[PDB]
Amino acid sequence: QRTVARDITLLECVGKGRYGEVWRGSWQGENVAVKIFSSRDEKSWFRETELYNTVMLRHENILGFIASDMTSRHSSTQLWLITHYHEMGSLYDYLQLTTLDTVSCLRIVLSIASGLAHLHIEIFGTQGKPAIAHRDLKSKNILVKKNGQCCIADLGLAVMHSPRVGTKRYMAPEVLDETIQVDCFDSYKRVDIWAFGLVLWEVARRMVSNGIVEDYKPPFYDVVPNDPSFEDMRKVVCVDQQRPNIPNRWFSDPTLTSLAKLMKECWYQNPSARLTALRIKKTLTKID
Numbered sequence: 001q002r003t004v005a006r007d008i009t010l011l012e013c014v015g016k017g018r019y020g021e022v023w024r025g026s027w028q029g030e031n032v033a034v035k036i037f038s039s040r041d042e043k044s045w046f047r048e049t050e051l052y053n054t055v056m057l058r059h060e061n062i063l064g065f066i067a068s069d070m071t072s073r074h075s076s077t078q079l080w081l082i083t084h085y086h087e088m089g090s091l092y093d094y095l096q097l098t099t100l101d102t103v104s105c106l107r108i109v110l111s112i113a114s115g116l117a118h119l120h121i122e123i124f125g126t127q128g129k130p131a132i133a134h135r136d137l138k139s140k141n142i143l144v145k146k147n148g149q150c151c152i153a154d155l156g157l158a159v160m161h162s163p164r165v166g167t168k169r170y171m172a173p174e175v176l177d178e179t180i181q182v183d184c185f186d187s188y189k190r191v192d193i194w195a196f197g198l199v200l201w202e203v204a205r206r207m208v209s210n211g212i213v214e215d216y217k218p219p220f221y222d223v224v225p226n227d228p229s230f231e232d233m234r235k236v237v238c239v240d241q242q243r244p245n246i247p248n249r250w251f252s253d254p255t256l257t258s259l260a261k262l263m264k265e266c267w268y269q270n271p272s273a274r275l276t277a278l279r280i281k282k283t284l285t286k287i288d
């Protein structure tokens with residue numbers, strides 16, 4: 001009746017970490033990305049698979065799902081997530097070596113805000129969706145597309161509303177001080193907004209103005225170690241209430257001046273004071 005071609009040719013490893021590995025693969029002559037999960041991160045495969053079995057997200061700024069595969073082996077279970085492949089790699093990678101102009105900076109950050117608002121919004125009726133919070137938004141979990149927009153990846157920690165925790169460097173104050181209202185879905189949206197503000201800062205540093213640009217640095221590079229502890233982060237973000245520095249040179253440029261204001265409104269200590277993703281989008285469409 002029909003042949004179901006399932007062979008994927010794994011061609012090059014494009015990432016390896018505690019999560020497992022990501023490979024560029026080929027299916028029917030077309031590139032796919034294959035994430036092969038480590039045993040330690042099996043629950044991320046289950047959560048993302050459960051989410052996609054509940055709602056088939058389809059959005060230009062969300063990494064495109066293709067398949068979830070579980071294969072029995074002699075003494076283990078092999079778990080793969082298969083998605084669209086973005087050859088330019090992650091935003092984190094891209095910002096190391098690339099500087100941006102005003103148009104490309106805004107296009108990047110608006111595309112991220114668009115994907116995030118799509119996650120956050122509940123849509124009713126047929127072809128709707130539950131509201132979703134990401135819970136691990138960061139520049140390594142955003143991919144750059146050839147058209148200059150980005151897409152958000154890795155829903156392994158995501159939560160829906162109708163051992164894995166987030167990356168500590170990007171954790172909001174209410175996570176670090178354990179005051180987050182865990183029974184309120186809006187709390188998780190507000191944690192994502194904090195992280196979005198950090199990503200906005202990382203990108204804006206790389207936008208040139210008046211011949212000046214900052215080197216790529218991760219948030220809080222000047223105040224915590226590599227692989228900062230939970231306590232290291234809590235002291236900076238909660239006790240001392242530090243925030244990423246805004247360089248003077250941004251205040252000569254109208255775009256970076258507006259982006260600095262936007263960042264600040266993602267970083268309020270009080271989570272309910274932070275802007276929503278929808279409001280961020282509107283503000284970004286009015287810049288330039």
Ligand SMILES: COc1cc(-c2cncc(-c3ccc(C4CCN(C)CC4)cc3)c2C)cc(OC)c1OC
Nearest residue numbers: 014022033034035081083085086089090141153154
């Ligand atoms: C964030 O997480 C996930 C990401 C991806 C994913 C999707 N497209 C492309 C990539 C990629 C391609 C290429 C490079 C490098 C390698 C070649 N050269 C050195 C420069 C560029 C980096 C990255 C990835 C990693 C897939 C995932 O799942 C299948 C992910 O997990 C949800």
